[PDB]
Amino acid sequence: SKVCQVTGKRPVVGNNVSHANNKTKRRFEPNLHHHRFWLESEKRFVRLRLTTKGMRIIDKLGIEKVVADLRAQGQKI
Amino acid sequence: AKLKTRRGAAKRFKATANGFKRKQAFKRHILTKKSAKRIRQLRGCVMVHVSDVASVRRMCPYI
Amino acid sequence: MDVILLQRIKNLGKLGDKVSVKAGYGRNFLIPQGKAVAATEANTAAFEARRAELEKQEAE
RNA sequence: CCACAAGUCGAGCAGGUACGAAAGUAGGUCUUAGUGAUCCGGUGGUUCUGUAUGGAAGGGCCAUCGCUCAACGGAUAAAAG
RNA sequence: UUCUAACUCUGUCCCGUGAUCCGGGACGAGGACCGUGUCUGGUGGGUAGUUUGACUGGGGCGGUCUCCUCCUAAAGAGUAA
RNA sequence: AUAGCACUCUGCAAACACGAAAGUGGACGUAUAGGGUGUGAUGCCUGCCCGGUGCUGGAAGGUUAAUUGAUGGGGUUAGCG
RNA sequence: GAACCCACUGUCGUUGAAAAGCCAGGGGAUGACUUGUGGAUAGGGGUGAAAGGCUAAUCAAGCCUGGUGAUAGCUGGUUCU
RNA sequence: UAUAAUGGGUCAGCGACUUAUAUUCAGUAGCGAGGUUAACCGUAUAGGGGAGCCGUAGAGAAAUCGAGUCUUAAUAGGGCG
RNA sequence: CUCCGGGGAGGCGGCAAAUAUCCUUUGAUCCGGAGAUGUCUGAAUGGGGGAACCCACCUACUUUAAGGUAGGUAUUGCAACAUGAAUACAUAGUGUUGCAAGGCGAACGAGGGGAAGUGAAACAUCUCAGUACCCUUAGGAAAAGAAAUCAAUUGAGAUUCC
């Protein structure tokens, strides 16, 4: 499913609103994609499915911290 | 349940001691061509006619 | 991002300079390969504290 | 005059005015056609209101502007077989 | 115009493995393009919801739909096709 | 419908179709192949028109969206009064 | 030209022997043939040598149950003195 | 409408203006410039519970005034009382 | 069927009579409590399957022929232990032991999705309505809850229901 491993973002629902104010169901999707990160402490590449906000959090906190946090929630990475 | 006021009518009518008062029509625009007498005699409030009082009462139960 | 250079680069600087680079450059080329480290307080303090002399002696 | 909403005539009182020596005449044109409700907004004023208080924004009142809404009491801002 | 390090391969080899899926490893060919997310202009009977007036010597076609003057209107007012 | 004929698209991870995606058919095929459209064995043949709509190729002049935010005009108050 | 598969004409039958038949004639009958068993495609979808045909005697959008006691300016009815 | 306009073969049984809340008017009973409690408590149709509602004053868009008030330069005139 | 307690002249369930045989004052039938037994299908869990069927393996004992009894043999998640590639350390993978879960059921709760008939005397904004319905998942209740809340004489004091 389209779920980010770092933030938990997922598609949401909303409306298309026309100029005549007709309303139609739509979805908003995350900016999801796969990326490989070098885990030094284990000497290996780890593949994650995440958003660009997830990348910003990784740049802010470091990859090993995020990996430990994810393993703390029972994720197999 | 409770009776509900017709808010459009509530915005048009107000209650006096023995009836209802209202504003006069034809004073919103297109005023240059109208004579001074019509301009000044269509200004102010008048009373609601007895033929429309019953309908106003049904539409505004609490005023 | 803010990066301090563990090892010299032709134009970014030489042996421990701190400098700003675009995010993709540091994220995809420098940090995985070990030619730089991000400018956090802990990493920076570790940089000057102990490994500064060893890195300087490891000039090549 | 009239179902309503509307429409028509009006002596006379107060202020300012024009024309007449004056008594006086003048609130458009001999008259009856030349027109469009409400809603929503624009412009000029204003001793009204102003979500703690002082202001302000917005609203109200007075004057005025935008419809061949002509299927002309005008079902929508927006529609052929 | 070059480069490789993100990214792509429904290309080759090795392992999981008794496997034309998949994952990892090594190459090769591309490469900051292609592709995806949010915003945005165009196109869009492919699909969906609907609209497409009334009078009327049946309905359609034609004409008409609001206002003013005269006659019909029977010496007050009003009076239809 | 048909054998025959013609136009047109498709260079392979093909065009095209199904599906939300993963994927599947096309095809374990490769322009002498595959899809769409029209005509309809065979004989003789198949005239003129590119103004309209469509398709294909050009141009970088006019107009135009998101984004960007230069200037100008208001509100408020330190102070001057 | 028999079996087998079809359905061109006529009489009969029409509360039928039969919710599509019998009888007398008729067409194909080594092929784009007929048939058994078991599978696949599901409703704005499927399938169709194309008739809007077929999808359980039902098809210009199957059947069942729910929204549901849909709405009906229309037709009917509305009980002793 | 005897109508050749509709409905009924006959009998017996069943079959259609209701219920809850709000409001207005008319009767009737209590109290009377006053009338009345809601939820709730309560060995519970009692007794407590006065928050609230209607009446007792209008005018004005409103600020404001108040047996007056609005309009206006106006104590004039006029509208609502 | 067994034990304990109650009870004191009948009883062998009903449709469904009668017969026949019986049981019972050495305490029956019956009533209450605690045990024992409890075929096959069904989450069904050894593999399969057209539910109530087909086919197996392992161990301990037992039989003498082609068997019997008892137990075990699902998947996933977690923990421990063992083993173990490409690849040198490792890791992935593989296996054993122990623990847990799955299914069913009225309403009420919380969350993820979400109409149209109808009304507007037409209809698109709007209404119907976050209703009907689909999906996931608790508990005896759930949810909420101890102010970065209201108020405006500088006062109140968490949430929920009338």
Swiss-Prot record, chain B:
It comes from the Bacteria. One of its GO terms (cellular component) is cytosolic large ribosomal subunit. Pfam families: Ribosomal_L35p. Keywords: Ribonucleoprotein, Ribosomal protein. SUPFAM superfamilies: L35p-like. GO terms for biological process: translation. PANTHER family: 54S RIBOSOMAL PROTEIN BL35M, LARGE RIBOSOMAL SUBUNIT PROTEIN BL35M. This is Large ribosomal subunit protein bL35. It comes from Acinetobacter baumannii (strain AB0057).
Swiss-Prot record, chain C:
GO terms for cellular component: ribonucleoprotein complex; ribosome. One of its GO terms (biological process) is translation. Keywords: Ribonucleoprotein, Ribosomal protein, RNA-binding, rRNA-binding. GO terms for molecular function: rRNA binding; structural constituent of ribosome. The keyword Cell wall biogenesis/degradation does not apply. The keyword Ribonucleoprotein applies. Belongs to the bacterial ribosomal protein bL9 family. Binds to the 23S rRNA. This is Large ribosomal subunit protein bL9. The gene is rplI.
